[PDB]
């Protein structure tokens, strides 16, 4: 399926990915930032 | 990719009972060997199992129990287990026997304050209120002139209304220094104004001002709501005995003078009973008759024990839990009359006695373990066996109390966990009631 | 900074917040007119007067092209990537002169980790059908 | 103009001449507005100088399309199509050709 779907798209899709044209602008830093629930949140989450 | 993780707030502090989470009974009412933080005491826990069903049944008034047994047998731990077992919705009122000795009010009435405080009440209070920005304010004079009517314009995110009010509300608005462009709240029940702030629409009007600017209110100018109030009969008694509600100069100044207690007269308690019976008939109220717990009951004065004959026989009274750690004492205020648990025999008939008894060494090992993992510490098995040995040599509390000093020594000399050499060192740094009473009797010439 | 959220109720909570702290916010949302989607964009670029911009991922995250943002905060994660990635790349863009930090703000264990697990699973399964 | 955009046009032109449609699927921020405008800028043979097109788009984009048609090559006759029934009716009657693009959204 993968190679067939690739070969169907190859004649009529362009997809470069950023580094091939954004040659000199760097990637995003992604920060997965965790939080606890607050006391009222912990209670209402438990009530659910 | 990257992560961030934070939580700077300290925990609750570990207290001498905070491992107690419930009575640890099964659904048939039998005691589990150790559960919900408790260990052992099977008969005394199964007896408390009958009492927590007694409370939840609501049927009784003034039934009472005496947890009786040596120091360190867990009497206050079972009464705390009852407080956890009932949950927060039912009032458990903790009291100590020597708290009746007020200097503001009689001993024979401090007991009635606690008895009225242990009877909880849940009220479906409908409040009807006005809130908004004060867009207009005009008091009206009329002929004998005096101020007699008030016109107020209020505005919210849901448009605006003009309301017409009693001049006591204008005197309240004047007291709160309310002016046009303020945001206010007025419950029409109390007639109580709150100035919320100045409307945030005006926040640019000055370079420098003292005001809290606040966003314009939402929903209608005039609206009604039900508050599910939790309250106790004592809160009704005392609020009527020194009134701070309404908005006259008197209530406004009973809010300033020293808040002395007063010997509430039985006529007031009677009129409160009549009123709350009508809130119960109206379906506005649910009564939740709770528990009074008198720790150290053995030093209520004989005035108080003889009051409790009448108090425990009231058709109103809460269920009462007593604790005593004493043998055949002389009863306080009698000069020289002795009776079991330090309580007069005349009162001792009126209570179901729950005898509570000394632990085996195996129950001490098991409590010390459950306690150590609650104080948040790790302890090696030969060290805990040495604390169990100290339990046989001394008492449960001394054995438990070596845990946190041992953990302090463990982290100070760099370990993760308590080794036996830490407990064996701490045992020499800190004496106990039995071993101190040796050196203090040996050196008796010098104190 | 850009802030993205799903619930209009939550964007109202964040507007309540940035009225309270004096953060000079502005918002775009499903209720907003094309004349606001003109001007609110044109005033977030071309100015420094607007510290933060409040967005839906669906009404805001497509073609808006806010090159004057430096950072992005996902107050919500969507069940599907692409929507987040379009929303991120409308700060992280041809015409910037800076790094971009994208923050996802997530509750431990309760429910948002299930959304994030599907987002992780999708964000890999989505690759092999393209590259 | 940029070289990857011009090579995008030389790729699209063979699809157009074959009667084949295609996807500009590049990562976001790479100028699909510029590339889809450049259908006019880099095919000289009249169809792509005075022919009427239409753009359909998410509603937040309508003005950035209308702006970017002015910034790259302003020569093309562009019609907005957004806002009130009266305002869209006024413009609808213009196409009663000098309508080189209309800028639109899927609800309309
Ligand atoms: N059955 C028990 N299970 C668990 N902990 C207990 C138990 N009995 C006593 N304790 C604990 O040991 C200590 C002594 O009990 P306590 O209730 O304070 O005794 P006392 O009857 O003298 O007031 C407290 O820390 C208490 O929580
Ligand atoms: N030559 C150029 N000079 C300046 N900006 C350009 C140029 N080529 C492309 N751009 C930028 O392309 C951006 C439009 O990208 P867009 O079509 O929205 O990409 P996508 O749809 O993939 O996210 C605009 O911000 C525009 O300024």
Tell me if D30 and A14 make a contact (CB, 8 A cut-off). Answer: no
> What is the rounded end-to-end Cα distance, in angstroms, of chain A?
42
Q: Which superfamily, per CATH, for B118-239?
A: RuvBL1 DNA/RNA binding domain (2.40.50.360)
- D vs C contact (3+ beta-carbon pairs below 8 A): yes
Q: Give the Cα separation of D35 and C105 in Å (integer).
A: 36
Q: Which residues of C touch D57 (CB under 8 A)?
A: 63
Candidates B23, B73, B86, B107; CA nearest to B333 is B107
Q: Give the Cα separation of B359 and B425 in Å (integer).
A: 25
Task: Enumerate residues 6+ apart whose C-beta is below 8 A from A39.
Answer: none
Interruptions in chain B after residues (C–N over 2.5 Å): 144
Tell me, in Å, the resolution of the deposited structure.
3.5
Q: Is D33 helix (H, G, I), strand (E, B) or coil?
A: helix
Which conformational region is residue B181 in: left (phi greater than 0), alpha (psi within -120 to 50 degrees), or beta?
Answer: left
- In words, the CATH class of domain B359-442 is mainly alpha
Question: DSSP of chain C, one letter per residue?
Answer: -EEEES-HHHHHHHHHHHHHS----EEE-TT--HHHHHHHHHHHSS-SS---EEEETTTTTTT---TT--EEEESS--SSTTHHHHHHHTTS-TT--S--EEEEEEESSSSHHHHHHHHHHHHHHHHHTT-
Candidates B403, B389, B398, B383; CA nearest to B361 is B389
Could you tell me if C120 and B1 are in contact, meaning their C-beta atoms sit under 8 angstroms apart? no
Mutating to test ligand 1, I would choose from B43, B72, B433 the residue with most ligand atoms within 8 A of its C-beta, which is: B72
Residue B34 CA, closest ligand 1 atom number:
3
| HEC assignment per residue over C33-71 | CHHHHHHHHHHHCCCCCCCCEEEECCCCCCCCCCCCCCE
* Segments making up each domain of chain B, as ranges: 8-117+240-358, 118-239, 359-442
Q: Is D79 helix (H, G, I), strand (E, B) or coil?
A: strand
Task: Enumerate residues 6+ apart whose C-beta is below 8 A from C21.
Answer: none
| HEC assignment per residue over chain B | CEEEECCCCCCCCCCCCCCCCCCCECCCCCECCEECCEECCHHHHHHHHHHHHHHHHCCCCCCEEEEECCCCCCHHHHHHHHHHHHCCCCCEEEEEHHHHCCCCCCHHHHHHHHHHHCEEEEEEEEEEEEEEEEEEEEEEEECCCEEEEEEEEEEECCEEEEEEECHHHHHHHHHCCCCCCEEEEEECCCCEEEEEEEEHHHCCCCCCCCCCEECCCCCCCEEEEEEEEEEEHHHHHHHHHCCCCCCCCCCCCCCCCCCCCCCCCHHHHHHHHHHHHHHHHCCCEEEEECEEEEECHHHCCHHHHHHHHHHCCCCCCCEEEEEECCCCCECCCCCCCECHHHCCHHHHCCCEEEECCCCCHHHHHHHHHHHHCCCCCCECHHHHHHHHHHHHHCCHHHHHHCHHHHHHHHHHCCCCCECHHHHHHHHHHCCCHHHHHHHHHHCHHHC
Q: Which residues of B touch C16 (CB under 8 A)?
A: 215
**C24 CB near a chain A CB, below 8 Å?**
no
Nearest ligand, CA B21:
1
Task: Enumerate residues 6+ apart whose C-beta is below 8 A from B422.
Answer: B383, B406, B409, B410, B413, B415
Tell me if C92 and D27 make a contact (CB, 8 A cut-off). Answer: no
Distance from chain centroid for Cα B223? 33
Instruction: Report C:53-92 residues touching D (Cβ under 8 A).
Output: 59-60, 62-65, 85-86, 89-90, 92
Q: Which residues of B touch C103 (CB under 8 A)?
A: 4
**D18 CB near a chain A CB, below 8 Å?**
no
Q: Which superfamily, per CATH, for B8-117+240-358?
A: P-loop containing nucleotide triphosphate hydrolases (3.40.50.300)
Residue D7 in marked binding region: no
Could you tell me if B391 and B364 are in contact, meaning their C-beta atoms sit under 8 angstroms apart? yes
Tell me if C110 and A45 make a contact (CB, 8 A cut-off). Answer: yes
Nearest ligand, CA B370:
1
Distance B76 CA to ligand 1 centre (A): 7
Q: Give the Cα separation of B385 and D104 in Å (integer).
A: 81
Annotate B335-344 with b (16+ C-beta within 10 A) or e (fewer): eeeebbbbbb
Q: Count H helices, E strands: chain A?
A: 2, 2
**Which helix (H) or strand (E) segment is D72 a member of?**
helix D62-72
Q: Is D51 helix (H, G, I), strand (E, B) or coil?
A: coil
Q: Give the Cα separation of B403 and B427 in Å (integer).
A: 10
Distance B80 CA to ligand 1 centre (A): 10
Q: Is D74 helix (H, G, I), strand (E, B) or coil?
A: coil
Q: Give the Cα separation of A40 and A29 in Å (integer).
A: 32
Annotate B303-333 with b (16+ C-beta within 10 A) or e (fewer): ebbbbbeebbeeeebbbbbbbbbbeebebbe
Q: CA–CA distance from B368 to each of B14, B400, B403 (Å)? A: 15, 6, 8
Q: How was this structure determined?
A: cryo-EM
Phi, psi of C45 (to 5 degrees): -70, 175
Distance C65 CA to ligand 2 centre (A): 9
């Amino acid at each position: 399926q993968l190679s067939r779907l690739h070969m169907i798209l190859k004649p009529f899709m362009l997809r470069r990915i950023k580094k091939d044209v954004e040659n000199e602008l760097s990637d995003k830093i992604e920060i997965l930032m965790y939080c606890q629930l607050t006391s009222r949140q912990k209670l209402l989450y438990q009530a659910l | 990719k990257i992560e961030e993780v934070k939580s700077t707030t300290k925990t609750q502090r570990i207290a001498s009972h905070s491992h107690v989470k419930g009575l640890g009974l099964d659904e048939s009412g039998l005691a589990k060997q150790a559960a919900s933080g408790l260990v052992g005491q099977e008969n005394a826990r199964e007896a408390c199992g009958v009492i927590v069903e007694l409370i939840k049944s609501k049927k009784m008034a003034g039934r009472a129990v005496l947890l009786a047994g040596p120091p360190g047998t867990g009497k206050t731990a079972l009464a705390l287990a009852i407080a956890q077992e009932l949950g927060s919705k039912v009032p458990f009122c903790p009291m100590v026997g020597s708290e009746v000795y007020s200097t503001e009010i009689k001993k024979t009435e401090v007991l009635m304050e606690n008895f009225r405080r242990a009877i909880g009440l849940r009220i479906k209070e409908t409040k009807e209120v006005y809130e908004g920005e004060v867009t207009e304010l005009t008091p009206c004079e009329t002929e004998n002139k005096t101020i007699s009517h008030v016109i107020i314009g209020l505005k919210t995110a849901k448009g605006t209304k003009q309301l017409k009010l009693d001049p006591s509300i204008f005197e309240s608005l004047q007291k709160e220094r309310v002016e046009a462009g303020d945001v206010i709240y007025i419950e029409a029940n109390s007639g109580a104004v709150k100035r919320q702030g100045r409307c945030d629409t005006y926040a640019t009007e000055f370079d420098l001002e003292a005001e809290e600017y606040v966003p314009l209110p939402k929903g209608d100018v005039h609206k009604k709501k039900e508050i599910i109030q939790d309250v106790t009969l004592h809160d009704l008694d005392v609020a009527n005995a020194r009134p701070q509600g309404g908005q006259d100069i008197l209530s406004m100044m009973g809010q300033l003078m020293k808040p002395k207690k007063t010997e509430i007269t039985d006529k007031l308690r009677g009129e409160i009973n009549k009123v709350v019976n009508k809130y119960i008939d109206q379906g506005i109220a649910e009564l939740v008759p709770g528990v009074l717990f008198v720790d150290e009951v053995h030093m209520l004065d004989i005035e108080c024990f003889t009051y409790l004959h009448r108090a425990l026989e009231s058709s109103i009274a809460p269920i009462v839990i007593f604790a005593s750690n004493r043998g055949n004492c002389v009863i306080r205020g009698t000069e020289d009359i002795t009776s079991p648990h330090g309580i007069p025999l005349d009162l001792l008939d009126r209570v179901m006695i729950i005898r509570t008894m000394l632990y085996t060494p195996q129950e001490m090992k098991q409590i010390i373990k459950i306690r150590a993992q609650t104080e948040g510490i790790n302890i090696s098995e030969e060290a805990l066996n040495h604390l169990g040995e100290i339990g046989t040599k001394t008492t449960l509390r001394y054995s438990v109390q070596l845990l946190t000093p041992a953990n302090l020594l463990a982290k100070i000399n760099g370990k993760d966990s308590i080794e036996k050499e830490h407990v064996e060192e701490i045992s020499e740094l800190f004496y106990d009631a039995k071993s101190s009473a040796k050196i203090l009797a040996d050196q008796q010439d010098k104190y | 900074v850009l802030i993205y959220s799903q619930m209009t109720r939550m964007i109202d909570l964040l507007e309540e917040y940035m009225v309270y702290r004096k953060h000079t916010y502005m918002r775009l949302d499903g209720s907003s007119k094309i004349s606001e989607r003109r001007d609110m964009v044109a005033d977030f670029q071309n100015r420094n007067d607007i510290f933060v911009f409040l967005l839906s991922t669906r009404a805001g995250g497509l073609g808006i092209n806010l090159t004057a943002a430096d950072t992005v905060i996902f107050y919500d994660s969507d069940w599907n990537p692409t929507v987040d990635q379009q929303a991120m790349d409308r700060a992280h863009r041809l015409g910037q002169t800076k790094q971009v930090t994208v923050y996802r703000l997530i509750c431990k264990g309760t429910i948002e980790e299930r959304i994030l697990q599907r987002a992780k699973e999708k964000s890999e399964i989505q690759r092999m059908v393209i590259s | 103009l940029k070289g990857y955009q011009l090579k995008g046009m030389n790729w699209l032109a063979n699809l157009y001449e074959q009667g084949i449609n295609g996807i500009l699927a590049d990562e976001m921020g790479l100028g699909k507005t510029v590339q889809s405008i450049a259908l006019l800028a880099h095919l000289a043979e009249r169809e792509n100088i005075w022919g009427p097109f239409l753009i359909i788009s998410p509603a937040s984009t309508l003005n950035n399309w209308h702006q970017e048609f002015t910034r790259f090559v302003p020569k093309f006759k562009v019609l907005p199509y957004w806002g009130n029934p009266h305002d869209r009716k006024v413009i609808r009657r213009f196409w009663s050709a000098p309508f080189h693009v209309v800028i639109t959204s899927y609800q309309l």
